[PDB]
Symmetry: C2
Subunit: 130 residues, 2 copies
């Protein structure tokens, strides 16, 4: 019950592997390949310096086709994140509301530092047994 | 634009692989193991005769924890405030996936029994192959 108030940065649950990113100039078709090959349902979109500006989700692709155009153009006019300091309690709530499988972790300036997956939260809970 | 009107049962996208199920009496703690080991975010709840009863999600688990996770799936369902057939058109299914935000759609036959599943991942691969 006390683990809920502990900052995720100390919960040994954030990972920095398999979080390949894309850019405003990345073709959608290329991002689809990233989603399928990487077993992920969303890819982070950052700039040249590493700042997280948004994300491209498998859902967006479904809306897109009711190809080669970049991610920027694909999101043109159509209808998330946390820091290592946030508490697991508020994060689990935001995950439920937004219904996403990955919460990207950004530093104090907005740069992508890691990712917190729903899978790792569940495993944390599973071990919560014992 | 014509593939959107084709029934998924003819799109060679439905699978019968990783789809282990559970029951109303299955302890949530056991369900959590299925989600993690199967690398899935939801598990189909079926009964003794194969009928699809409901679906339990990882999001549901997060709900129970604002306490003991040995409680059955049945009881857990009480604390929370999906499906299709091989005849449904791809267009209808992609819209429902988008609106409900799920990664898997369980496929049932005409009698309501689970016969397979349709993952978002496979829909994407189907789209990707659109590079012909």
């Amino acid at each position: 019950t006390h683990f809920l108030k502990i900052p995720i940065g100390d919960l040994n649950i954030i990972t920095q592997d398999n979080m390949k990113s894309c850019q405003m100039t990345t073709p959608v078709i290329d991002v689809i390949q990233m989603l399928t090959q990487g077993r992920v349902s969303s890819v982070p979109i950052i700039d040249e310096n590493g700042y997280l500006i948004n994300v491209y989700e498998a859902y967006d692709v479904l809306g897109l086709i009711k190809l080669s155009l970049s991610v920027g153009e694909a999101l043109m006019r159509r209808s998330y994140t946390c820091t290592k300091n946030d508490k697991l309690s508020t994060i689990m709530d935001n995950i439920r509301k937004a219904r996403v499988h990955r919460f990207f972790v950004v530093d104090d300036v907005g740069r992508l530092v890691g990712v917190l997956t729903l899978s790792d939260i569940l495993k944390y809970i599973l071990l919560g047994s014992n």
